[PDB]
Amino acid sequence: DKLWILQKIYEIMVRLDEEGHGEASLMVSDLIYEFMKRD
């Protein structure tokens, strides 16, 4: 379902920030926005 992949994408965003990859975390944030803008 959509909830598992949302959670996995969210987790990558968090992991990237904790590991210091802030810029790549912002890019994953944009994907979360786009994904949820879908139906």
Partner: protein
């Protein structure tokens, strides 16, 4: 030259004609976002910022001014002060502001007020660092309506 290295665009008449004009009130809205998000501070735009943070009306006639603030707002280790909303149950209406911090419930299980699986804190930090590309550096933005 109201600020430095500015970039500005007026959607109504030229800044000179503003000098002839008079108005009951002027509003100055200001905030920080990423460089690649400045294009969303315009009438008719959609995106994470337009939709969930700051929204101009389709008929906006004002000015938008933005400048790179990397030297002031980026920090080695990350500036975690600046946040944006990533989740919201509906788009914002023009000039709406939402400062709530309720946990966003993405699935059907309750979140009981705590972040967890499919239960997300609704704000995210930009974590600005001096080494980010210009698209990801901070821009200060002023909107005059």
């Amino acid at each position: 030259n109201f600020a430095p290295f500015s970039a500005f665009k007026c959607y109504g008449v030229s800044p000179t004609k503003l000098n002839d004009l008079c108005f009951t009130n002027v509003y100055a809205d200001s905030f920080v976002i990423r460089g690649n998000e400045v294009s969303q501070i315009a009438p008719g735009q959609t995106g994470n910022i337009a939709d969930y943070n700051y929204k101009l009306p389709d008929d906006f006639t004002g000015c938008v001014i933005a400048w790179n603030s990397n030297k002031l707002d980026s920090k080695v280790g990350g500036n975690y002060n600046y946040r944006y909303r990533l989740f919201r149950k509906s788009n914002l209406k023009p000039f709406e502001r939402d400062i709530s911090t309720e946990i966003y419930q993405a699935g059907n299980k309750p979140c009981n007020g705590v972040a967890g699986v499919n239960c997300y804190f609704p704000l995210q930090s930009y974590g600005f660092r001096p080494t980010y590309g210009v698209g990801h550096q901070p821009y200060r933005v002023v909107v005059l309506s």
